[PDB]
Write an enzyme that holds these catalytic residues in place. Structure first.
Site, PDB file in Angstrom:
ATOM      1  N   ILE A 110       0.861  -1.212   0.000  1.00 12.41           N
ATOM      2  CA  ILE A 110       0.000   0.000   0.000  1.00 12.41           C
ATOM      3  C   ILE A 110       0.883   1.243   0.000  1.00 12.41           C
ATOM      4  O   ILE A 110       1.787   1.344   0.837  1.00 12.41           O
ATOM      5  CB  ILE A 110      -0.985  -0.015   1.168  1.00 12.41           C
ATOM      6  N   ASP A 111       0.590   2.176  -0.911  1.00 12.05           N
ATOM      7  CA  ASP A 111       1.319   3.467  -1.031  1.00 12.05           C
ATOM      8  C   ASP A 111       1.300   4.204   0.315  1.00 12.05           C
ATOM      9  O   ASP A 111       0.264   4.178   1.005  1.00 12.05           O
ATOM     10  CB  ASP A 111       0.723   4.294  -2.160  1.00 12.05           C
ATOM     11  N   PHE A 112       2.431   4.805   0.688  1.00 11.86           N
ATOM     12  CA  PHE A 112       2.609   5.779   1.811  1.00 11.86           C
ATOM     13  C   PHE A 112       2.652   5.101   3.194  1.00 11.86           C
ATOM     14  O   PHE A 112       3.521   5.483   3.985  1.00 11.86           O
ATOM     15  CB  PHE A 112       1.497   6.835   1.794  1.00 11.86           C
TER      16      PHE A 112
END
Lengths: 363, 363, 363, 363, 362
Positions: free
Chosen positions: E35-37
């Site tokens: 998952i991004d970030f």
């Protein structure tokens, strides 16, 4: 008929450009975007983000919110010439807000640099360069021409200097979806000035087909990391949907090749053919995992590819449980199902095709 | 009778100037404004905003709160000579507080400049210029004369330099309602010094009648954006009510032409003729959408136009659910129904007409 | 008998000076003030405000809390010579704490200046100058003599320089009650050094009788504003009670003239003559409006004027609902009915008269 | 027998030195003090106060927590030679933590100075000087010898300069209990170096018997204030218990004189002789008023004076309602009844007598 | 397959031979990377969103990153198709380890502004081992300069001390933190053909004199050189970690004490199906103190090849944590301790510290 909880038919959304009018619910979205003093997203050029505070938009995603609004507004300009001056005004504001430190400041807070444009950070400056171009196509205004030339030259020079085709986001993070925007921004600059920056696209489409795609499944791997050469070994629906949608505007044959395989791999039709939802990766039955944008990005891809059936199916999954209502001629959702919800439904409802935006007739 | 939850009859409010006395509830509002140490709005000249912190007044709206108090106090001075010294003192404080950075500082925080007066920002400096004038009419004091001459010359020169008639607020945002205040501030300067800055009004009334009004519906469009030429394509009740109220003091014929059409377009009479509420825009049945000030601004318009019936109907909608009480000869509302509530009910209850304020006899 | 929820009779409080002993409940208040390490108000000279944090005392009112404790301690010194050394020690601490920035810092936070004594701010430096004097009367200590001379000369010179008789608090805010303290501080300096700074009092009593009092009602107007000459047109009980109490020490004839009229105007006797409560202004039946100190300040005035009946009536209204209890020989209140509650009941219980404090015999 | 909720018999605690072993519950307290990384009080020399944050220890009382732990550890060294190296290590940490600004910084925050040692502040530097001495008795280490000589000379010189016998804490605050520690620290320095700094003790014991004690009640007054000569006119159990306990180590005859009168004045035996609780002052039936330490300080005094019966009675009052449990060979209390709870029960359980610590054999 | 378990002990131990991680280990790598970030291995940045979401206390982040790194080095050895990924994650592990959020406690406690110059082996030992594992896995010389600098500081500091090893906080000596430092010297030697590991014999001699109870096969909590004091409690988590690392340098040492360690601390229960570990002597309570005895013993069981105890401990630890896979990504509803997902990951993949040393090149 009109399925329950929907505001307008798929026929109506696809007919907007031909009828030279947006649907009443798209008009109500433009009202949300423009009406109330101070707290509407397109109220002023200022570095004021009240609209995003009220929606609880995470800081890192505001850049994507502004950009998706901008891409929708460019289609509104093409649909209804009576709204083209308004769309141009909103795009002026979109560009101004995109340049505020609230939007790009994560780049500095993470320790990557004080200038968001000089190197890397294509996830920001790709979207900004496309918005500069769309603003000038829509309005004919030379207001941002100097900045647009500067950023386009940075993108061109950085592509030329890299051993891989394209530009990283965070250092050593390569995302095909963020590169697709950068490359489309070169097509738009070329349309405006008769240059050939888009020439670099052939090498890029060759490169993303070698290591970054699973051609049998029609699906891109999550990311690439040049220092190690590593490809994260999961395929990603939202990554693929976004990339294919943008590439369709530059090389339609490319997206037409992979689209049917993309749908077999990720799209689940359910409720006797009336609905669809999109798996984010392989080896799961779960829909809209990860960032939770697979269904909403696929809605945009369905629009780009002219796939009315899948568009209708996805919108029947996404819109009704979000409980939309119009209050004082302005659209709101009680239960948005994801980040960037009103932004992506707006964009998908109006999207004329990235090809059409490139060929946009002058004022 | 006296309808339930009301404090005084419409007859009583309209009779105040003739009886040379404010009603007890207006006196109780002046007490809220002046009585308690530290936390009353007109406690001192200082840059202290405790009164606005307690009401949860958003920063961007404090300038409007102070200005509306000021316009009310100028009518109090005309109604009751025994209160004219008090009104003058409160206007001194109103001007002082209006110049505090808490009030104008949004201009700098948004990135538009460090000086709120030198260019644009008519939504702030229009109100400030009118307050300078009303202070001097009420008191005869030359305390702000130098500042008043400087700001009046800035407004005159900026009108003369613009290709459109008037002055923007945020850059590329033109609001008729904020311009109406600027133009009225020129009438007041002219009354004080025998100048002819008000000459620019004819061109302004011509301009706002071409592109910015729907004459069949008697209603202004939300806003104008000179760079794109865009007019936001929705009509606004609060915009129209405020503008017609101020224009009535300069060109009564103009407001008399549009007022009946304004009422057909926006005003909903209900509860068997006893109450009224105001739609903010077209294509809705919902009352008090947008900023939620259509009913309260229309109450002020009804007062300016001498329409006792509509005044009574609107006040029967607005005041009772706000649950007013007088405690220790001081007025409070348990449930104010909007921003700027006590400010606008105060102003509407005392308003002598912007024309009468212009013709104010000396002390 | 002893009414229910009271700790001692009115006879007992008024007999303390003659019996040369404080009542057990006054001793228990001195214990609250002095006993527990760190958290008692008179623990140390330090800039430590734990005692005021625990009582939730608002910052702006701490200066009044310290001063009222000090005025009470000066009467304790006069009542019981065995407690005079202790009272002197507490007054040393009172003066030290009064000079801490936590106490005067509102002057700088409001934007009026970085020095709280150089000009204006009589609401602070009046109380500080009286405390310097009372410390030296009680102890004979020359510890603050230099500071006391400096502040007395600032007050004297500022009175001499003003076109009105006295000194403002916030700029352009004149309060008779805060001036009364400043003038009394000159009487105390004169008693200590044989000077004639008190000479300025005649002009002040002449001035406050012209514009600032309603002689028929025996009540001062809320405030005066020298720039405009405006008087806020409401009469104030707490303002009048405090002013008459302090003026009685300088010109007893003045307070004796207005006291009976003050009581007719504001004091409500109830519960068949057993209780009394004080209205804050005219045109209301409500008791203890505004800052909510009318009853408590009137309790002190009743003590100053020797009115046992009203003292008993007010204390029967104030003390019982506050639910006092003694734990470990120390006084607490479960439900204090106002700001400065324990401070004002302490001061009223011991107050020997401002005249008597002036004539205090040496140690 | 073993009363309910107790962990070990009074016989067992008093037998520890003879058996050359601490009880299992004392070992479990040493484990709480030393075991868990980061959050145990004796984890490292660092300026880390996680252990005190978890117990909600007020800043002003941390200095007393560290000191009481230190005095307990010095007795552990004497009881069990196998634990003497550990006790020495904990004392090294105790001295280091005592010198952190979190511990002494109230001195600067209150405005008394930037150096906590140079003048006054005996409530801090008395405890620090005793800890320097106990560290060196236990370990033979010269690590702090230079600092110890410097602080001992400061204490000696300040006693010699004062007209009263001893040293103030806050300026003009004299506490016998804090002085008792300073004087004991001189006895320890003398034992280490063969000096005669303890000579000043005779004058001090003469002085505290004149003005600061009530001989009928065998109880010290709360405090003395040299500038005014004031003695706070309440007697204090915690003040007396602490003072008598420390003085017993220098002049046992002094403490033996007053101890029986101290118990008559303050100690309440209850539950048919099984329990005891201590009144903090005269004129009350309430136990553990004020700082709430009378019972716990009396427990330490009972230990110092060899009074097994009173020790058992007090511990039967204090320990059971605190609901002690041993989890993973580590002692915790669910409901500590006061500040410094685990510190004072630890110290009282192990205390060998301040006399015995003075005569401590080398390692 | 017991209920609430995701895979058999046979499956975890067979991963290296099958040249594939189990699906649940792959789902842990997905939590780590997807998952991004918010995923821990999203970017090199000084961004700690992943640790904010898990409520990881500041002082323990350094241990979280290090345990992830040790697991990733075994993933590289298990599945060559995942070795490029593991190398990328180790790049990020090193970058994040150098951020002030991670080491800044050293400055806040008053011990210094530089976390590397002296002492602080609890931080720089883990960092030096991670530099080495990064280069073994990838062949990248990206950190070689820093790795040489830190290795020379560790060597010089050992050479200067009268006791064998290096303190953490000043006057705090922990065998477990030293074991990491010494293993980091073995890895540097494997990379450069040096003989920094020579100091190990003196260290193993020293920790056997004063710091261990040989009858109970258990190390004392800590040693304090100024006083010579040894805290007189034996510690399971201290011993489990130390024996696991020492097995990679002197296997004979850990083989001698391991059976005695198990008698002293390990409680088998539920008719032989489960086990839980006492943190100290004189108690029946499991997982006292920092609460890591069971999880560190799971890693020791893996290092020593003890399938039975591994199965028993995992049957105690995993089921009550209520694991689930959502969108091919692993989560636990009720993690039973600090560093939970980190230590279960590491224990499931651990190939042995010996095997990591002998890792074949790229």
């Amino acid at each position: 008929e009109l399925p329950p909880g929907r505001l307008a038919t798929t026929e109506d959304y696809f007919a907007q450009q031909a009828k030279q009018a947006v649907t009443p619910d798209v008009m109500a979205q433009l009202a949300y975007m423009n009406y109330i003093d101070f707290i509407s997203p397109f109220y002023s050029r200022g570095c004021s983000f009240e609209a995003w505070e009220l929606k609880h938009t995470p800081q890192r995603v505001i850049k994507y919110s502004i950009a998706f609004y901008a891409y929708g507004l460019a289609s509104v300009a093409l649909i209804d010439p009576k709204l083209r001056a308004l769309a141009g005004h909103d795009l002026d504001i979109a560009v101004s807000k995109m340049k505020c430190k609230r939007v790009w400041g994560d780049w500095e807070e993470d320790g990557f640099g004080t200038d968001p444009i000089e190197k890397e950070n294509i996830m920001y400056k790709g979207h900004l360069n496309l918005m500069y171009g769309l603003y000038q196509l829509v309005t004919g205004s030379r207001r941002y021409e100097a900045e647009h030339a500067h950023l386009t030259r940075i993108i061109h020079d950085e592509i030329a200097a890299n051993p891989f085709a394209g530009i990283v986001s965070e250092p050593d993070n390569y995302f095909v979806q963020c590169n697709s925007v950068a490359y489309l921004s070169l097509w738009v600059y070329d349309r405006l000035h008769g240059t050939d920056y888009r020439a670099a696209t052939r090498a890029w489409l060759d490169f993303i087909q070698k290591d970054l795609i699973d051609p049998e499944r029609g699906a891109f791997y999550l990311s690439y990391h040049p220092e190690s050469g590593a490809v994260k070994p999961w395929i990603s629906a939202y990554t693929t949907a976004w990339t294919l949608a943008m590439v369709h505007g530059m090389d339609p044959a490319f997206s037409e090749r992979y689209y049917p395989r993309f749908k077999q791999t990720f799209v689940e039709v359910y409720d006797e053919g009336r609905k669809a939802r999109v798996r984010e990766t392989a080896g799961t039955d779960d829909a809209d995992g990860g960032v939770g944008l697979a269904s909403a990005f696929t809605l945009l891809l369905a629009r780009e590819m002219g796939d009315q059936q899948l568009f209708d199916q996805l919108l029947n999954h996404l819109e009704p449980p979000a409980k939309p209502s119009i209050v004082s001629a302005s659209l709101r959702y009680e239960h948005p199902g994801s980040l960037l919800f009103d932004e992506l439904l707006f964009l998908a409802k109006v999207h004329a095709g990235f090809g059409a935006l490139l060929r946009m007739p002058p004022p």
